[PDB]
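PROTEIN–LIGAND DATA SHEET

This sheet pairs a single protein chain with one bound small molecule, coproporphyrin III, given as SMILES. Inputs appear in the order they were entered. The predicted three-dimensional arrangement of chain and ligand is reported afterwards as a token string under its own label.
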Amino acid sequence: KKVGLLVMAYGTPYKDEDIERYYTDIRHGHKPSEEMIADLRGLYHAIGGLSPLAKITEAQAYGLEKALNDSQDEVEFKAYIGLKHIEPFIEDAVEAMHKDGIEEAISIVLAPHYSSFSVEAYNKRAKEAADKLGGPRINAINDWYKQPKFIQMWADRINETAKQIPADELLDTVLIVSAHSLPEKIKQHNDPYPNQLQETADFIFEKVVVPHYALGWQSEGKTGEPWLGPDVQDLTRELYGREKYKHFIYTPVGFVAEHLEVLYDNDYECKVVTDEVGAAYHRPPMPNSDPEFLEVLRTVVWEKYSNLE
Ligand SMILES: CC1=C(CCC(=O)O)c2cc3nc(cc4[nH]c(cc5[nH]c(cc1n2)c(C)c5CCC(=O)O)c(CCC(=O)O)c4C)C(CCC(=O)O)=C3C
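PREDICTION REPORTED AS:
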């Protein structure tokens, strides 16, 4: 019997025509304004027409499927992609595991940190799917940022970029660690999310040559409601104002692929700020389908299966 690997991710439009139904799914049934759509289309057209996230996510899931199976002869994993706001939806993927006869599955979200607005939404949807059909049994991974190979991978990348900065200027360099912002209300109820990213920033900092680091947030929502701060653009200005850093190294470690939230929020917005103040901009490559990142996920999944009992 095969074991299902439910790999979950946010989803990205495949075509310009998908944008509206995508935006509406994101807005939970509320249809965006025609101008709103326009702006989103403009964003996607800034980064090069559409996001590579669709092909990256597939490489990541079928790369992990392959990596798990090539490293053992006890089980055969079958990977099923379940996106959040576009097809193949989470529910489509569970329905497929049922049809194919999967009895047990291990679900993983391509987002190392847990939050009530992200990972918890994925897992509730997949398990509500699994219960209506009566199969497969889904054993969910909730977070994997504490994985040593995960921390070492980012530290190695940051150190690669750092060595390419003049040593006389490395003391004027700062590492910005960030993730998707969320409505600050999550802290009222003890969400581990903000604390998990502080741990990720600390774990990495100890393993890099960059002498300074700060935690930031990106893609904050327009809701009048407060959101987790500071924003990476405001933090860059605040940091340059107090310390006059020459180099800014951005690591959006809450993400695992070069998609819109990285290519826009960092590679364009943060870069604008550094140019305005006169600082340099650095952004290490994201994990994407790199064999090291796939080995991180293979170890994450092979440990969940070992401790499944
Ligand atoms: C926690 C989190 C992650 C990380 C974990 C995970 O991966 O799940 C993430 C990832 C991503 N978010 C993405 C894109 C978008 N997120 C939006 C809107 C929102 N995201 C939110 C949360 C998150 N999002 C929230 C609270 C909203 C508010 C919507 C509402 O009003 O209820 C919107 C709408 C317009 C806008 O405001 O930007 C878009 C287009 C893409 C795809 C990029 C591409 O296509 O390449 C990716 C990987």
